[PDB]
Design an enzyme around this catalytic site. Sequence first.
Site, short mmCIF file in Angstrom:
data_model
loop_
_atom_site.label_atom_id
_atom_site.label_comp_id
_atom_site.label_asym_id
_atom_site.label_seq_id
_atom_site.Cartn_x
_atom_site.Cartn_y
_atom_site.Cartn_z
N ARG A 4 -7.63 1.65 -2.32
CA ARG A 4 -8.47 1.52 -1.14
C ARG A 4 -9.38 2.92 -0.82
O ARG A 4 -8.67 4.00 -1.14
CB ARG A 4 -7.55 1.19 0.29
CG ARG A 4 -8.57 0.76 1.36
CD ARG A 4 -7.71 0.41 2.26
NE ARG A 4 -8.40 -0.69 3.26
CZ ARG A 4 -8.30 -0.81 4.68
NH1 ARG A 4 -7.37 -0.55 5.39
NH2 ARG A 4 -9.01 -1.82 4.98
N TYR A 34 -5.95 10.58 3.78
CA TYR A 34 -4.68 11.02 3.36
C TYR A 34 -4.76 11.81 2.06
O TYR A 34 -5.63 12.25 1.51
CB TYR A 34 -3.64 9.81 3.51
CG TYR A 34 -3.44 9.20 4.74
CD1 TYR A 34 -2.76 9.74 5.55
CD2 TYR A 34 -4.14 8.04 5.52
CE1 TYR A 34 -2.22 9.40 7.08
CE2 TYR A 34 -4.01 7.68 6.70
CZ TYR A 34 -3.18 8.48 7.48
OH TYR A 34 -2.83 7.79 8.61
N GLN A 46 0.68 -1.22 -0.23
CA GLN A 46 -0.01 0.11 -0.13
C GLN A 46 0.78 1.31 -0.09
O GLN A 46 1.60 1.55 1.08
CB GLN A 46 -1.03 0.13 1.07
CG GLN A 46 -2.09 1.22 1.15
CD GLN A 46 -2.74 1.37 2.22
OE1 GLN A 46 -2.20 1.37 3.69
NE2 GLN A 46 -4.27 1.56 2.40
N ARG A 82 -7.14 -5.80 12.93
CA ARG A 82 -6.68 -6.08 14.59
C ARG A 82 -6.37 -7.57 14.96
O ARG A 82 -5.54 -7.76 15.59
CB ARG A 82 -7.74 -5.35 15.39
CG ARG A 82 -7.54 -3.61 15.22
CD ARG A 82 -8.86 -3.13 15.82
NE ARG A 82 -9.93 -3.30 14.88
CZ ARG A 82 -11.17 -2.47 15.30
NH1 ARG A 82 -11.22 -1.95 16.39
NH2 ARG A 82 -12.15 -2.86 14.36
C1 LIG Z 1 -3.28 -0.46 14.21
C2 LIG Z 1 -3.70 -0.09 12.85
C3 LIG Z 1 -3.04 0.20 11.74
C4 LIG Z 1 -3.81 0.64 10.47
N1 LIG Z 1 -2.92 1.01 9.59
C5 LIG Z 1 -3.76 1.12 8.21
C6 LIG Z 1 -2.85 1.57 7.10
O1 LIG Z 1 -1.82 1.52 7.04
N2 LIG Z 1 -3.62 1.63 6.01
C7 LIG Z 1 -4.91 1.30 5.80
O2 LIG Z 1 -5.54 1.57 4.94
N3 LIG Z 1 -5.58 1.04 6.97
C8 LIG Z 1 -5.04 0.90 8.27
N4 LIG Z 1 -5.78 0.69 9.22
C9 LIG Z 1 -6.97 0.21 9.23
C10 LIG Z 1 -7.15 -1.15 8.86
O3 LIG Z 1 -6.66 -1.79 7.80
C11 LIG Z 1 -8.83 -1.97 8.88
O4 LIG Z 1 -9.39 -1.24 7.84
C12 LIG Z 1 -9.49 -1.46 10.33
O5 LIG Z 1 -8.61 -1.91 11.27
C13 LIG Z 1 -10.50 -2.39 10.42
O6 LIG Z 1 -10.53 -3.88 10.02
P1 LIG Z 1 -10.61 -4.64 11.51
O7 LIG Z 1 -11.81 -4.47 12.07
O8 LIG Z 1 -10.23 -6.05 11.22
O9 LIG Z 1 -9.19 -4.04 12.29
C14 LIG Z 1 -5.07 0.41 10.38
C15 LIG Z 1 -5.64 -0.10 11.50
C16 LIG Z 1 -5.27 -0.27 12.78
C17 LIG Z 1 -5.97 -0.68 13.94
O1 LIG Z 2 -4.95 4.58 6.75
C1 LIG Z 2 -4.46 4.52 7.78
C2 LIG Z 2 -3.11 4.52 8.29
C3 LIG Z 2 -2.54 4.30 9.36
C4 LIG Z 2 -3.21 3.93 10.51
CL1 LIG Z 2 -2.50 3.70 11.98
C5 LIG Z 2 -4.71 3.98 10.49
C6 LIG Z 2 -5.27 4.40 9.01
#
Ligand SMILES: Cc1cc2nc3c(=O)[nH]c(=O)nc-3n(C[C@H](O)[C@H](O)[C@H](O)COP(=O)(O)O)c2cc1C
Ligand SMILES: Oc1ccc(Cl)cc1
Lengths: 404, 404
Positions: A239, A192, A110, A346
């Site tokens: 995304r 972003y 990504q 998560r």
């Molecule tokens: C610690 C953390 C870091 C994440 N980093 C990104 C990221 O770098 N890019 C992104 O598009 N989403 C990021 N997300 C969002 C997740 O990809 C995801 O969409 C969100 O946590 C929901 O899915 P889940 O309920 O299985 O955690 C992050 C989420 C968490 C909790």
């Molecule tokens: O799109 C993003 C990128 C980093 C994090 Cl921590 C959460 C969402």
Amino acid sequence: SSVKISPLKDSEAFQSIKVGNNTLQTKIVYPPTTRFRALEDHTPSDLQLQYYGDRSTFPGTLLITEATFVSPQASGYEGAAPGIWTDKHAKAWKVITDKVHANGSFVSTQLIFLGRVADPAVMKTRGLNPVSASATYESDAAKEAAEAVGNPVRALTTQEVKDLVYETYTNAAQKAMDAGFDYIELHAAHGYLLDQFLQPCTNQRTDEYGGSIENRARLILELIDHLSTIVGADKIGIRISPWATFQNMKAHKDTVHPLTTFSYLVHELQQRADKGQGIAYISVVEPRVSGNVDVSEEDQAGDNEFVSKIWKGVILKAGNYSYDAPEFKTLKEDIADKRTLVGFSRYFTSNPNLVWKLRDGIDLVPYDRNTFYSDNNYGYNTFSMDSEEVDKELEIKRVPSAIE
Amino acid sequence: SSVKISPLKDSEAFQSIKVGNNTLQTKIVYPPTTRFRALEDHTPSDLQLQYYGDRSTFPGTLLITEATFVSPQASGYEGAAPGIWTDKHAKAWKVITDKVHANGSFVSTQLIFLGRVADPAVMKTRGLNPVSASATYESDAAKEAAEAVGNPVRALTTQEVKDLVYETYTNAAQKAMDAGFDYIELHAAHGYLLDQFLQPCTNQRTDEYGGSIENRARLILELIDHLSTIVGADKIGIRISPWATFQNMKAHKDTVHPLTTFSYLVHELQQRADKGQGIAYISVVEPRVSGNVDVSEEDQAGDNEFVSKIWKGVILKAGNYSYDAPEFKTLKEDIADKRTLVGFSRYFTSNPNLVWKLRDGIDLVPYDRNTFYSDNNYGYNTFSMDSEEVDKELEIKRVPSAIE
Ligand SMILES: Cc1cc2nc3c(=O)[nH]c(=O)nc-3n(C[C@H](O)[C@H](O)[C@H](O)COP(=O)(O)O)c2cc1C
Ligand SMILES: Oc1ccc(Cl)cc1
Ligand SMILES: Cc1cc2nc3c(=O)[nH]c(=O)nc-3n(C[C@H](O)[C@H](O)[C@H](O)COP(=O)(O)O)c2cc1C
Ligand SMILES: Oc1ccc(Cl)cc1
Ligand code: NA
Ligand code: NA
Ligand code: NA
Ligand code: NA
């Protein structure tokens, strides 16, 4: 608490599916998850090599890397996030993709660009400004912080926007190929840079890149088109988080509703698919989650049905899919059309063998928010160890180091 | 009786391994197993498509097809075995390899040529003789049967041997590539044609293809060398059964001992590997089994240690590996060097999910010798059904039909 789950083995989640030129053997995906365990110069680390390795063991799993900077101007985190703009970055990432490939799995990187939320002090050390579609801030506090260090946010000029397409993202795409990535994913979500261009609260430009729905989308589609000629549409994803209010996106409260903005974009993508230039997948964040924040059903202003109606290709959905565990009713409905992948972020942090656990209905290990963003191995790769073999104090001291 | 087994999940059997250009995610292999469910013109059937499909579900498994005729002259079974010499054969096999590939697995086709054991009546209908390195029979009864129909076995002429290399096997190799096979395996075992050339009891030629150890091996190595230029050494394997007395090979009682014959061959293969033309694997039959017949330890005249000492590449071993179940001590010793695959033929017939069963230590379903070689679906694809859903009388009536 541990999450009781029913086995997904006999379900659609373990039917193969072609995504671009590769075939996945599971529809369970690890979505991009920022963890800040890269090296300080943004080269991927020893910790990351094992982290992605540990999550590739069900053969034919798709992993999507944490947000990865396309260039110096794209950075702006205080924590240590990885990059993909130098040979050094690519060479280290290649060790990781090699390892994922050796288990028969696949990896998308990504590509992120922070934009208006870039830390002004961090950017100043590079001799750069925080940049965006327009000179805006996510909050008054953000504005004050930038002005305090004499590094205010500034609107990219038209030429700088062109440079993003033909230099920044182009080089990132090329390094990603050098690094052996199977796909590159444009990060157009969560407030972003690309999201900043898309929506009117963040884009008030008067050149060809703003001033209408079509103009706001122009950069994103220019990226899609140009990178398609570089790496092939089959190696491209994107995304979006239509409903998210992360980093002060107005979403349903903006002057243009997300249904309008994102249906425009998705329909343009499908028209490219009709011409034989269909990208590999569209990744969408379900309205249960906004960025890293859970959203109550009361606050949910819409859903992503429109993506499925308009786009005919592969869709990846993620966002608290275990909310109706153990039966996974929603997950099962969502993958029933046979072209949908489901992501777990998560729970993948605390369950490196998550695909296996979901397959056979093994209780999920709870995740630890406290160690999502810390700088060391504790709460990171420790989840792959037996609980009683973990030396906590040693692991807290284990910071990222060079691969080998 | 059902076979209790311990789980092999944490063992070397589930560590990846590169074989030629592909990486397997399990070292458990399905060895070539003749079942006679092809169509009468030797085109692969609907039954076969499902049969191989059912055995490919652990992603990254290697399957090796039943013995498959390289040409009309290579045939000679009464039952309906498949071929790979026409476009029609290749097109049907391609449906099968496509299906195996879609599960992320791989497939080698074993190329057989019957030689002196070809049924003389069957060969007569093609207007052909049974052929061999020399005019010999596996028994007096075989001799009488051939002479009774006026179709005695005859020694191939030197030119005919050349034709095998540059026509018969060449065309078979090309069709196999058209058919999407990942490897071709030369059948040099169990007293068939190539084995007939190798050993002195069956080869008394006085041209360049007989009269010494080196000359007897000449055809086989000519095949290796020529097919290496056609399909690449990385797509080639070979099977040998040094200790077998199947179809009246004298083995340890011959005038040249198998240790001499087969060490010569294997060392020549390794020398090719040292020159960058190493074939993908050598398949060897463990002395516990001779053809399809179990051999008592009393009658075992040697072992295959020499193959491991001389050859540095991938080795596939098969032959009653469950004999020391549930602990699998021998299997574990045999794969400890990290370059060895282990094959299960008989148990794979009754356990289409055998890799999964072995992984998690699930009791093995006993196999049914009575239906190894019959002409219909009973005892074939029925093992993939729930016991109580099987309509026996219907399945006995289900003969092979065209794919789709
Ligand atoms: C610690 C953390 C870091 C994440 N980093 C990104 C990221 O770098 N890019 C992104 O598009 N989403 C990021 N997300 C969002 C997740 O990809 C995801 O969409 C969100 O946590 C929901 O899915 P889940 O309920 O299985 O955690 C992050 C989420 C968490 C909790
Ligand atoms: O799109 C993003 C990128 C980093 C994090 Cl921590 C959460 C969402
Ligand atoms: C019904 C049957 C058919 C077989 N067909 C072939 C064959 O076509 N080619 C071959 O090289 N071996 C063939 N074999 C031998 C097997 O590949 C294998 O080496 C042998 O059965 C020992 O392995 P196992 O104890 O797991 O069955 C066959 C064996 C059986 C029982
Ligand atoms: O080599 C072979 C070929 C067929 C059979 Cl049934 C047994 C062994
Ligand atoms: Na593996
Ligand atoms: Na869906
Ligand atoms: Na599969
Ligand atoms: Na061995």
